[PDB]
Amino acid sequence: PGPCCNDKCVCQEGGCKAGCQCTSCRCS
Numbered sequence: 001p002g003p004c005c006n007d008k009c010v011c012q013e014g015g016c017k018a019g020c021q022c023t024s025c026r027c028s
Protein backbone atom coordinates (compact mmCIF):
# COMPACT_ATOMS: atom_id res chain seq x y z
CA PRO A 1 0.00 0.00 0.00
CA GLY A 2 1.11 3.65 -0.26
CA PRO A 3 2.55 5.08 2.98
CA CYS A 4 2.72 8.89 3.54
CA CYS A 5 5.97 10.29 2.12
CA ASN A 6 5.95 8.37 -1.16
CA ASP A 7 5.91 11.75 -2.89
CA LYS A 8 5.13 14.17 -0.01
CA CYS A 9 6.92 15.05 3.24
CA VAL A 10 3.89 15.68 5.44
CA CYS A 11 5.62 15.65 8.79
CA GLN A 12 5.95 19.43 9.01
CA GLU A 13 2.20 19.32 9.53
CA GLY A 14 0.14 16.12 9.91
CA GLY A 15 -0.14 14.64 6.41
CA CYS A 16 2.20 11.72 7.15
CA LYS A 17 0.84 8.23 7.91
CA ALA A 18 1.67 5.03 9.84
CA GLY A 19 4.45 4.14 7.36
CA CYS A 20 7.03 6.94 7.16
CA GLN A 21 9.69 5.53 4.84
CA CYS A 22 10.82 9.11 4.17
CA THR A 23 13.61 9.81 6.70
CA SER A 24 13.49 13.53 5.81
CA CYS A 25 11.23 14.18 8.80
CA ARG A 26 11.53 13.02 12.38
CA CYS A 27 8.59 10.68 12.28
CA SER A 28 9.68 7.99 14.74
Ligand SMILES: [Cd+2]
Pocket residue numbers: 005008009010011016020022023024025
Ligand atom coordinates in the same frame (compact mmCIF):
# COMPACT_ATOMS: atom_id res chain seq x y z
CD1 LIG B 1 8.58 12.86 5.59
Ligand SMILES: [Cd+2]
Pocket residue numbers: 004005009010011016017019020021022025027
Ligand atom coordinates in the same frame (compact mmCIF):
# COMPACT_ATOMS: atom_id res chain seq x y z
CD1 LIG C 1 5.94 10.48 6.36
Ligand SMILES: [Cd+2]
Pocket residue numbers: 010011016017020025026027
Ligand atom coordinates in the same frame (compact mmCIF):
# COMPACT_ATOMS: atom_id res chain seq x y z
CD1 LIG D 1 6.85 11.95 9.08
